[PDB]
Structure formats: structure tokens, C-alpha cells
Amino acid sequence: VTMSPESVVAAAGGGNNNSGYNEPQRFALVVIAVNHNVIRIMNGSMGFPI
Amino acid sequence: IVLRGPTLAPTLDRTATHTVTRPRALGSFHSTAGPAKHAASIMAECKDESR
């Protein structure tokens, strides 16, 4: 991923009042994935074969 | 492409099914018995001084 000039200029402080980036800013990256699986129901019990 | 030992999850069996809870065994150790007995007292039918 590539950042932006707005992000790099807002990372530091210097913003005036009611600007949001008055204090130095920090960012974090989060990744979510969705996957398929098979659930087996038999003999009154459940579990993943794989 | 990556090759590795496939992950196999064991299944079947049964957990927490039809609780019975009957492990008790009767029996204990204490005194045996008591050897006590009594008679029917003593009767007395005598008078008139029959020698």
C-alpha cells in the first residue's frame, strides 16, 4: 500500500484550532479475509473435517 | 506452491452425553452385634406357711 501527501502532512502536528491534526497523528493497517469451510453434523456431534 | 503435511482433525466420540453418576458401592465396617437377653422376671405365689 502507498500513503498520500495528505497523510504524510497530517502525520506531523502544526494544525490550527478545529483542524483535527493539531496533534501528531498515528495510523494502523488492518486486513480482513473471508473464507469457506465445511461443517459435518453426525452422531450428535459437530466438527471440521479439515 | 507450498507443500506441507495436511492438517487432519479427529472427530466422532461423544462428550457430556447422558450423565449417569452411579459409582457408589454400599458397605462399611463397624461393631458386629450385642449379646444381651433377659428372662421373664420371677413369679411368687406362696402363703399360708405350708411347711
From TrEMBL, chain A:
The source's superkingdom equals Viruses
From-to range in the entire protein, with total length: 413 to 462 of 463
Q: Which residues form a coiled coil?
A: none
Name its cellular compartments: Virion
Of which family is this protein a member?
Answer: Belongs to the NCLDV major capsid protein family.
Q: What name does the UniProt record give this protein?
A: Major capsid protein
From TrEMBL, chain B:
Q: What is the lineage of its organism?
A: Viruses, Varidnaviria, Bamfordvirae, Nucleocytoviricota, Megaviricetes
The domain of life for this entry's organism is Viruses
Protein's name according to its UniProt entry = Uncharacterized protein
